[PDB]
Design an enzyme around this catalytic site. Structure first.
Site, PDB file in Angstrom:
ATOM      1  N   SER A 122      16.502 -40.877 -25.437  1.00 39.53           N
ATOM      2  CA  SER A 122      17.135 -41.705 -26.454  1.00 39.53           C
ATOM      3  C   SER A 122      17.705 -40.816 -27.555  1.00 39.53           C
ATOM      4  O   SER A 122      17.651 -39.587 -27.479  1.00 39.53           O
ATOM      5  CB  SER A 122      16.130 -42.709 -27.023  1.00 39.53           C
ATOM      6  OG  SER A 122      15.306 -43.247 -26.004  1.00 39.53           O
ATOM      7  N   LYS A 182      23.692 -51.287 -24.260  1.00 39.63           N
ATOM      8  CA  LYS A 182      22.708 -51.581 -23.227  1.00 39.63           C
ATOM      9  C   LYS A 182      22.218 -53.021 -23.257  1.00 39.63           C
ATOM     10  O   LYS A 182      21.512 -53.435 -22.333  1.00 39.63           O
ATOM     11  CB  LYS A 182      21.509 -50.632 -23.351  1.00 39.63           C
ATOM     12  CG  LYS A 182      21.862 -49.168 -23.153  1.00 39.63           C
ATOM     13  CD  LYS A 182      20.639 -48.275 -23.266  1.00 39.63           C
ATOM     14  CE  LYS A 182      21.024 -46.808 -23.182  1.00 39.63           C
ATOM     15  NZ  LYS A 182      19.859 -45.909 -23.410  1.00 39.63           N
ATOM     16  N   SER A 203      11.997 -44.738 -20.819  1.00 36.68           N
ATOM     17  CA  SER A 203      11.287 -43.473 -20.958  1.00 36.68           C
ATOM     18  C   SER A 203      10.681 -43.297 -22.345  1.00 36.68           C
ATOM     19  O   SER A 203       9.709 -42.551 -22.491  1.00 36.68           O
ATOM     20  CB  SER A 203      12.222 -42.305 -20.643  1.00 36.68           C
ATOM     21  OG  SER A 203      13.325 -42.281 -21.529  1.00 36.68           O
ATOM     22  N   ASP A 248      11.713 -38.952 -27.968  1.00 37.02           N
ATOM     23  CA  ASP A 248      12.033 -38.959 -26.545  1.00 37.02           C
ATOM     24  C   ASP A 248      13.411 -38.353 -26.336  1.00 37.02           C
ATOM     25  O   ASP A 248      14.363 -38.712 -27.037  1.00 37.02           O
ATOM     26  CB  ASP A 248      11.981 -40.382 -25.974  1.00 37.02           C
ATOM     27  CG  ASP A 248      12.462 -40.461 -24.536  1.00 37.02           C
ATOM     28  OD1 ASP A 248      12.336 -39.462 -23.798  1.00 37.02           O
ATOM     29  OD2 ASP A 248      12.975 -41.529 -24.146  1.00 37.02           O
ATOM     30  N   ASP A 281      18.553 -48.415 -27.643  1.00 32.83           N
ATOM     31  CA  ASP A 281      19.296 -47.242 -28.077  1.00 32.83           C
ATOM     32  C   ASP A 281      20.642 -47.184 -27.358  1.00 32.83           C
ATOM     33  O   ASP A 281      20.914 -47.950 -26.432  1.00 32.83           O
ATOM     34  CB  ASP A 281      18.495 -45.964 -27.826  1.00 32.83           C
ATOM     35  CG  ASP A 281      18.374 -45.631 -26.352  1.00 32.83           C
ATOM     36  OD1 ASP A 281      17.930 -46.503 -25.577  1.00 32.83           O
ATOM     37  OD2 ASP A 281      18.737 -44.501 -25.966  1.00 32.83           O
ATOM     38  N   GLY A 336      16.227 -48.388 -14.811  1.00 27.93           N
ATOM     39  CA  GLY A 336      16.179 -48.112 -13.389  1.00 27.93           C
ATOM     40  C   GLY A 336      17.536 -47.711 -12.853  1.00 27.93           C
ATOM     41  O   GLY A 336      18.216 -46.870 -13.447  1.00 27.93           O
ATOM     42  N   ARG A 384      22.196 -44.072 -26.248  1.00 23.66           N
ATOM     43  CA  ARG A 384      22.442 -42.814 -25.554  1.00 23.66           C
ATOM     44  C   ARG A 384      22.497 -43.046 -24.049  1.00 23.66           C
ATOM     45  O   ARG A 384      21.564 -43.606 -23.465  1.00 23.66           O
ATOM     46  CB  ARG A 384      21.363 -41.781 -25.887  1.00 23.66           C
ATOM     47  CG  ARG A 384      21.437 -40.531 -25.020  1.00 23.66           C
ATOM     48  CD  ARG A 384      20.405 -39.488 -25.419  1.00 23.66           C
ATOM     49  NE  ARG A 384      20.761 -38.813 -26.661  1.00 23.66           N
ATOM     50  CZ  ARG A 384      20.091 -37.792 -27.177  1.00 23.66           C
ATOM     51  NH1 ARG A 384      19.013 -37.305 -26.586  1.00 23.66           N
ATOM     52  NH2 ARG A 384      20.513 -37.246 -28.313  1.00 23.66           N
ATOM     53  N   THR A 408      15.999 -43.732 -22.593  1.00 20.23           N
ATOM     54  CA  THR A 408      16.264 -45.125 -22.927  1.00 20.23           C
ATOM     55  C   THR A 408      15.036 -45.780 -23.549  1.00 20.23           C
ATOM     56  O   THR A 408      13.932 -45.668 -23.024  1.00 20.23           O
ATOM     57  CB  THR A 408      16.693 -45.930 -21.684  1.00 20.23           C
ATOM     58  OG1 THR A 408      17.848 -45.324 -21.093  1.00 20.23           O
ATOM     59  CG2 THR A 408      17.019 -47.365 -22.062  1.00 20.23           C
TER      60      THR A 408
END
EC number: 3.4.25.1
Lengths: 205, 193, 142, 210, 209, 192, 224, 205, 224, 193
Positions: free
Chosen positions: E186, E50, E146, E183, E34, E64, E36, E18
């Site tokens: 994402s 999101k 992340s 990352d 993002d 979280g 995902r 994320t």
């Protein structure tokens, strides 16, 4: 590191100046909160103009210093007076090769005709660093700023004495593991000079 | 403590070991691991110390209160549902305790026997046969059980299971008390397992 | 001047601590049938293995209210907390709705929660003794 | 205590054909959620028409492959340049893995080649040397996704025995594309080594890089 | 009342046996994320929204425990709507920040929600970061998740005081794209929300792909 | 015989239809799929929690129908399930629930899944719940196709269940499958 | 070993069309104390290799001793030790990786992350990474520690694939490295403003720049 | 103290001078080794001429500061401008009564017509100490000596600004958890003055 | 509570023929850091009582608040609050010991060691000790912490039994206390050179001396 | 594993349970927990897995070597002393393992039976009767033992002890193999216990 072992909560300084080097320390050895020895001499001589101060385990540092002095006697029997760099290298090898079993840190101050006074620091772990001046011990943390604001290259002997006295007086003032008298050794081309300063003198600075 | 139960075509047979507490030698002739919830519904229980007895007596008191209040008898299904609810409630705020209950009854509205098993977490399963406490009697039950078995054939299967259990237990296993619930109520087989 | 609730643990225990469910046959012992807790819940089990946040959550609002009263006492005097407590007692005392559990509008106005929602509002929540008469007996203390 | 193991999660797949073998793997090298590299091959030609891959902790797999290749060099020196068969290679790898029984390699190993009769052969190894010959095996993070795709596509549905090299390559590419779409650790690229009587051929394809 | 503690001992017994960014620009704020959504290493959803709406001009994005993030956002949104009706005024970002901070501090960090909150009110544009234990902070550009390190690197590369709306949108999109590429958490798409002073909020679903 | 914990639930969407299927134990009662008029819920995990959730949702849906004077829609039921799950934040049920249905007014199919504290995962293709087989998700991914007819959707979901069962525990495995349309619901058993 | 005491943070590196660039800061930390300033962490080996080391400082000095001994042993009884028998980056990396894996297998590891950069005798670029576990890998951009999380995303925007390497000049790569170092100084608490950089080019050889400082810092928006 | 909680590794100074008081701090907030915010404002205003800096848990200190500001508004509604001693007492009561559940330390700087500028320190535990000057934070340990050698009573405004700037520059230099810009508030009879100094200025001192 | 943070070391005290003497240093330590200089640890209560407290400083300030509130509540509406209804040392000690034991029983203790010294209204000397566990005792000489191990042996050589009390003048007792403080400054690493002393005499009342320093220190034999 | 031994006036009777390892079902008819050290000295052993068998075989090899070398037989006392020394030696550098041995012999120089017991730490005790593995047979032995008992009375006492043991063990206890050492050597009681 070992359970029930004597540690070295000291205040150590070494400063290079125009004529040579000066090594200074306090004189307090404690076991927890009790002061085991208030007049201990922490200035260890490994050669006539090569001296050191120790931190970490007392037994490990004493053994390492004895081996280094023996090594330097062997070297002197062959090639004469060793350089400060050679002693620092021997200290570094002994500390690094045994870092998994011994806890030791060493500040080395030396004088020789070629390099004209040098300071080396070997912290825990066994790395070596050459510096114009060095501080170590539990009481050094309280004088990091002051020293950085008051050190100059090529100071005279008296200015270096005053700088070390002030810095160690502050270190003694703020650190509970440091106290007693201030002992210094001055290494130049003239010889070795020992100095001592008492609490009633440096506490009024 | 080990409990067994078999639902045969017209009745339910419940067998409970007449065991005693450990460390104290006891002589008695009573089935302490069985409470009669209603004249046509019986409950057998196994598990740890007096928590299980407290729970069984609490259930019996509640069911007797219902029977007195309504002048009527709850069906075995409703009794099992109430027991499951109370068991789930009892461990909502405490560490769970080991308990396992077999409820056997004869529903007269439907005129058929019923058997239920509830474990320590409050999981109710309706089964033709069941057991608890055994470390295999399941294969013996599977091979020799039929839905339309009579009471005598169920008793013979129970005797075979008892013999299989006793072949791997010390002589300290005194025996098993057997009870039968059917259209005439609850009776005790004083002859043998 | 507390923020997190303190002194939440019990210091003494007894078999007759819950006066509302005492047995009539043995008045020194509780009545397990009328407790309706499943019948296998000793009081000692409630003294151990609790979630550490449960006591903080259960006494949070009372702690904040007590801190507010202490601040009023320090700054305004005794009369201000006295009056706030008197108003709250008067409102809570004359409300008796055995068929409802929601709080009163006036209580929310006094608590300054007219336009505030917490999880206690969203989630506000037998065989024996869950009727009007039990609530009457508890309210009247008879 | 110091932890000597790690994880560089990747995906490999070995398939044995009628007279050929294929060993494919994704080229993504990662640490936790970071990407160490997007093209780090894990399938190697070990000589004598044998392809090898050791998926898992990358250092252990590299060490195992290095040891096997050096042993092959000495085998050629000591036996008049005799060709090492696939079964002998499997036995050597079993011994190499079991030599670390009390300090094992943290890898799963697949080798592929041609047997004595010219048929394709694939061998799979457990971390301590237990090995077996198989028609097809997927290993790594996305094996549980790749295997159902092949099972739906092929019957072990045209039988595997009559498939050509190109069809097998297409099946591997499609399965890896699906796994890349579904699995975060799969992507970037796919490399396939094909072993036939003429030798070893390499093919590379791109995958989604997110 | 409230969140229940029943079956805590039972659950213990059973156990014994994320990329998100926020950017300020000269006349407002932008939030981006993002799309995902994963359940472990498996991509559960390639198009997940999101960006959440506390109020028509106050938006947020969280990380979280997902259920905690959603529940806290919805509770604060209900409180904000009631307060706005009570005062007959447009809600302020400071009020939402205060409610969130006090609610999270009440639960002593047991509610695992980490938030970026952006908004526009009659006092201006505001951007805040909120930690689970109750600490809050202000900033001109923020990252979370992340993939927050790559996005923060991009933001530190190309941020300046005088940013137009288009420059801010491009910068946020680039930060989310860097988190997408570098990352594993994402990767799918970029959702944007632009809140400009004096205008309606603009919600751009799948701004890039 | 008393061990019924676990299991799997698969939900898929076709064209103007949905399919929800669950695994069933052997013979000599406990089904993990329930319905509340035209909304279907399948629960995997601890059996006592499954029974508790079914009873609670029957309670709430009956009260909802009595008050609103209409049956509850899949979206509203999904929100209700989420809030009820979140109520037990610190003592959560050990369950994985899946919801399927058809909205009456719009006719759009709907499926969703939940975590143990009520986080909603709304999927357009399929939902898999349970940990009985790891390759079940892969088989569903390989077999699913968008916009399938009810017969094709039933064949696909049945084949997925059969293939999952083949490479898993056997000798008594069964399946229950529901095909839901706007006005017709078909329930079938699979003994294979 | 078995615990780090004095450490350095990160080393970053990338390939460009005609060579490689590597960079690292000059700080040795003692926990939260920024104790030693003036620690050189780029070690030039030969005229064609640079080794960047992050992690334990004492182990880094041990590795420096090993590299010097390798250089000395290469020239032992070697007339053309600098013309045609000079050390290659691949040889140095192979030796270092073997040492790292062997000391990992002994449960006596060297707590370092190492990047080897240089140009082979045929003009090919060499850039590879090893760590304390013995894990090795190669990529057109490499970084250790915090840089791996922040410098790599910035550097991959310039060189994202192999085909991007011929399109990248030395100026662009150097600017990217400098910007990455500035970002690291912004967001790394154990970083320093002073850093060293090294360019290895198949035409111009080795260029080693010391005493480089992060400049053009946007400390202006903090007034309000 | 709580697991996974934001801590305050700051550098805080408060100095009383001739015309009033000055409060200074750095602007760095870190999570382990990563810098979460490099331009954070650490000078908290609880009343028009009563300011504070916080150490320990960020959430606990923020909650305590909010309660103190509310308390001072209530006090002002009754008796007018509160004294620095009253605010320090409220801070001390909140910190001490909750010391088993909250980790908080507060430096309070205030000005009023009666006392003419005061500094109070409340370290962890909840005790209160009134001092001519105070330092706190992880970076304060490195400037204990320097401050002790450079503080004078009744300094001018510029001298106090220079003293704080030098001390905080050293603290930033040696502490990894401290950095960024230096922010100061000057509280006198004339009013409240905010000052900021950038790294390129104080790093050349 | 449940952990000490800022602490003071030790308090010493003895009886002489006509009164009591108590003394304590002026340091508040923060671990190994000698943080706060100028902490008063002797609290005079009334005209006839002195309370010495060692240990946690915040709890010491709480106890000071309790003592002040006790004095205020005793004064209240009492007309002769200073003539015949003034507080006695025994009353203060009884209250303090009750508080200490009650807070021990709550698992919420005050981490302090307390000595109460003074003269009763009938001229009798009062000297008693309580600690965090609620343990109380009396003796002609009392000390806390390190003093209990070093000051008591020196003080018992002057006053060893009850019969020695009438033979001890104020000068001898004060000299013994000063020498004990000097020894503590020699051998205690958490001690200070500055200390306060208090004499309570049935004739001359309360004499409180502040800013006393250890003098005549034999730092001369360290030269060799 | 349980072992028992009784020294009667003219012989030594050793009884060892013919048990088996757990998890594997075995059909065998042999005494696997007894080794003949010498034609007039027998050793029975109980304890954990193959460590005990290794120790017993090592002892047997050493004693056979002595018998071959000297063309003579060691007395039971010397055999027991050697076993005690070897058992003490075997655990001087390793974690101790559970082992208990009963050595029964007939000394022909003295013409009398002897019985010794050695525990896992190497403690040798000379006893008229002994046992190991039983959780009481001690009282039965104390009340019904006399120094001048014949072989038949010792066998009767052993049978009583076996019955007492079997009254509190499951049917998995197949039986006990009994051997007798006397002036004619070592023989096996093929009839019963």
């Amino acid at each position: 590191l070992k359970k029930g072992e004597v540690s070295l909560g000291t205040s150590i300084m070494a400063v290079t100046f125009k004529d040579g080097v000066i090594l200074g320390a306090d004189s307090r050895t404690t076991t927890g909160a009790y002061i085991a020895n208030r007049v201990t001499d922490k200035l260890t001589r490994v050669h006539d103009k090569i001296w050191c101060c120790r931190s970490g385990s007392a037994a490990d540092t004493q053994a390492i210093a004895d081996i280094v002095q023996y090594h330097l006697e062997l070297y002197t029997s062959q090639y004469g007076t060793p350089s400060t760099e050679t002693a620092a290298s021997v200290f570094k090898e002994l500390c690094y090769e045994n870092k998994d079993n011994l806890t030791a840190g060493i500040i080395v101050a030396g004088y020789d005709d070629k390099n004209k006074g040098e300071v080396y620091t070997i912290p825990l772990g066994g790395s070596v660093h050459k510096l114009p001046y060095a501080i170590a011990g539990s009481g050094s943390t309280f004088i990091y700023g002051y020293c950085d604001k008051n050190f100059r290259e090529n100071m005279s002997k008296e200015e270096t004495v005053d700088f070390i006295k002030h810095s160690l007086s502050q270190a003694i003032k703020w650190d509970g593991s440091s106290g007693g008298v201030i002992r210094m050794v001055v290494l130049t081309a003239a010889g070795v000079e020992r100095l001592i300063f008492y609490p009633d003198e440096y506490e009024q600075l | 403590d080990i409990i067994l139960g078999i639902r045969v075509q017209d009745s339910v047979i419940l067998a409970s070991s007449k065991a005693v507490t450990r460390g104290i030698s006891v002589l008695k002739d009573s089935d302490d691991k069985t409470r009669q919830l209603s004249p046509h519904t019986l409950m057998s229980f196994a598990g740890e110390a007096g928590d299980t007895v407290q729970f069984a007596e609490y259930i019996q008191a509640n069911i007797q209160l219902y029977s007195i209040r309504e002048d009527y008898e709850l069906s075995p299904q409703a009794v099992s549902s109430f027991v499951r609810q109370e068991l789930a409630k009892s461990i909502r705020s405490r560490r769970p305790y080991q308990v396992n209950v077999l409820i056997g009854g004869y529903d007269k509205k439907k005129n058929k026997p019923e058997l239920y098993q509830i474990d320590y977490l409050g999981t109710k399963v309706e089964l033709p046969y069941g057991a608890h406490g055994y470390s295999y009697t399941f294969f013996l039950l599977d091979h020799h059980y039929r839905p339309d078995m009579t009471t005598e054939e169920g008793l013979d299967l129970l005797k075979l299971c008892v013999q299989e259990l006793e072949k791997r237990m010390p002589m300290d296993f005194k025996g098993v008390i057997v009870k039968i619930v059917d259209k005439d109520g609850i009776r005790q087989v004083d002859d043998f397992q | 001047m507390n923020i997190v609730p303190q002194d939440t643990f019990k210091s003494q225990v007894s078999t007759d601590q819950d006066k509302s469910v005492l047995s009539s046959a043995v008045p020194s012992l509780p009545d397990t049938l009328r407790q309706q807790e499943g019948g296998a819940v000793p009081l000692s089990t409630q003294l151990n293995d609790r979630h550490p946040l449960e006591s903080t959550l259960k006494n949070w609002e009372t702690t904040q209210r007590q801190r507010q009263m202490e601040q009023y006492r320090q700054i305004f005097g005794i009369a201000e907390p006295m009056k706030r407590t008197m108003e709250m007692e008067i409102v809570n005392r004359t409300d008796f709705n055995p068929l409802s559990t929601n709080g009163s509008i006036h209580r929310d106005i006094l608590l300054n929660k007219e336009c505030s929602i917490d999880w206690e509002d969203v989630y506000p929540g037998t065989m024996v003794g869950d009727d009007v008469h039990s609530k009457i007996e508890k309210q009247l203390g008879i | 205590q110091f932890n000597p193991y790690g994880d560089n999660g990747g995906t490999i797949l070995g398939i044995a054909g009628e007279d050929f073998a294929v060993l494919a793997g994704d080229t993504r090298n990662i640490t936790d959620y970071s990407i160490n590299s997007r093209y780090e091959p894990k399938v190697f030609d070990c000589g004598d028409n044998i392809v090898m891959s050791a998926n898992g902790f990358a250092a252990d797999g590299d060490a195992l492959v290095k040891r096997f290749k050096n042993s092959v060099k000495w085998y050629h020196f000591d036996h008049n340049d005799k060709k090492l068969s696939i079964n002998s290679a499997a036995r050597n790898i079993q011994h190499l893995l079991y030599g670390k029984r009390f300090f094992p390699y943290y890898v799963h190993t697949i080798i592929a080649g041609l047997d004595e009769d010219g048929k394709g052969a694939v061998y799979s190894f457990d971390p301590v040397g237990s090995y077996e010959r198989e028609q097809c095996r997927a290993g790594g993070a996305a094996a549980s996704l790749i295997m159902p795709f092949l099972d739906n596509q092929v019957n072990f549905k045209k039988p595997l025995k009559y498939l050509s090299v190109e069809e097998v390559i297409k099946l591997v590419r499609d399965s890896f594309t699906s796994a890349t779409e579904r699995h975060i650790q799969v992507g970037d690229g796919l490399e396939i080594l094909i072993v036939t009587k003429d030798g070893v051929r390499k093919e590379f394809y791109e995958l989604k890089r997110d | 009342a409230g969140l229940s503690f029943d079956n805590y001992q039972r659950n213990n017994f059973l156990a014994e046996n994320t990329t998100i960014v926020g950017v300020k620009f000269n006349n407002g704020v932008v939030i981006a994320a993002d799309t995902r959504s994963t359940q472990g290493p498996i991509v559960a959803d390639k198009n997940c929204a999101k960006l959440h709406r506390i109020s028509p001009k106050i938006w947020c994005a969280g990380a979280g425990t997902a259920a905690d993030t959603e529940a806290v956002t919805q509770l604060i949104g209900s409180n904000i709507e009631l307060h706005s009706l009570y005062t007959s005024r447009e809600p302020r970002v400071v009020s939402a920040l205060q409610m969130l901070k006090q609610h999270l501090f009440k639960y002593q960090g047991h509610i695992g929600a980490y938030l970026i909150v952006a908004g526009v009110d009659p006092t201006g544009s505001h951007l805040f970061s909120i930690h689970a234990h109750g600490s809050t902070d202000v900033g001109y550009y923020l990252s979370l998740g992340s993939g927050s390190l790559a996005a923060m690197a991009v933001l530190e590369s190309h941020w300046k005081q005088d940013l137009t709306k288009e420059e801010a949108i491009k910068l946020a999109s680039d930060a989310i794209q860097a988190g997408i590429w570098n990352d594993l958490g994402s990767g799918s798409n970029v959702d944007v929300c632009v809140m400009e002073i004096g205008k309606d909020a603009e919600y751009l679903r799948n701004y890039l792909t | 015989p008393s061990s019924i914990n676990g299991g799997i639930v698969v939900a898929m969407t076709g064209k103007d239809c949905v399919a929800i299927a669950c695994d069933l134990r052997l013979g000599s009662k406990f089904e993990k799929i329930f319905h509340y008029g035209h909304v279907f819920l399948g629960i995997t995990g601890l059996a006592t929690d499954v029974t508790t959730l079914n009873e609670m949702f029957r309670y709430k849906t009956n009260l909802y129908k009595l008050k609103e004077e209409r049956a509850i829609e899949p979206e509203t039921f999904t929100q209700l399930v989420s809030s009820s799950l979140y109520e037990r934040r610190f003592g959560p049920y050990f369950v994985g629930p899946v919801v399927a249905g058809i909205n009456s007014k719009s006719g759009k199919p709907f499926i969703a899944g939940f975590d143990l504290i009520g986080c909603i995962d709304e999927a357009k293709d399929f939902i898999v719940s349970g940990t009985a087989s790891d390759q079940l998700f892969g088989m569903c991914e390989s077999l699913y196709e968008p916009n399938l007819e009810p017969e094709d959707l039933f064949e696909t979901i049945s084949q997925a269940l059969l293939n999952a069962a083949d490479r898993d525990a056997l000798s008594g495995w069964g399946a229950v499958v529901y095909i839901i349309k706007k006005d017709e619901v078909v329930k079938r058993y699979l003994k294979m | 070993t078995q615990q780090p005491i004095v450490t350095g943070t990160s080393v970053i590196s990338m390939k460009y069309d005609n060579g490689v660039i590597i960079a690292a800061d000059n700080l040795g930390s003692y926990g939260s104390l920024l104790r030693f300033n003036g620690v050189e962490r780029l070690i030039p080996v030969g005229d064609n290799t640079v080794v960047g080391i992050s992690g334990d400082i004492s182990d880094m000095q041990h590795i420096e001793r090993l590299l010097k001994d390798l250089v000395t042993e290469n020239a032992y009884d070697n007339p053309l030790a600098d013309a045609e028998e000079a050390l290659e980056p691949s040889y140095i990396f192979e030796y270092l990786a073997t040492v790292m894996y062997q000391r990992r297998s002994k449960m006596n590891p060297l707590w370092n992350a190492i990047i080897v950069a240089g140009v082979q005798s045929n003009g090919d670029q060499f850039l590879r990474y090893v760590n304390l576990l013995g894990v090795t890998y190669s990529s057109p951009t490499l970084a250790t520690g915090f840089g791996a999380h922040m410098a790599n995303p910035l550097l991959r925007k310039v060189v994202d694939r192999e085909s991007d390497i011929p399109k990248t000049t030395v100026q662009v790569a150097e600017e990217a490295i400098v910007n990455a170092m500035r970002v690291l100084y912004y967001r790394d608490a154990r970083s320093s403003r002073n850093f060293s950089l090294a360019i290895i080019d198949k035409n111009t050889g080795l260029t080693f720049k010391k005493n480089l400082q992060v400049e053009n810092m946007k400390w202006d928006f903090a007034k309000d």
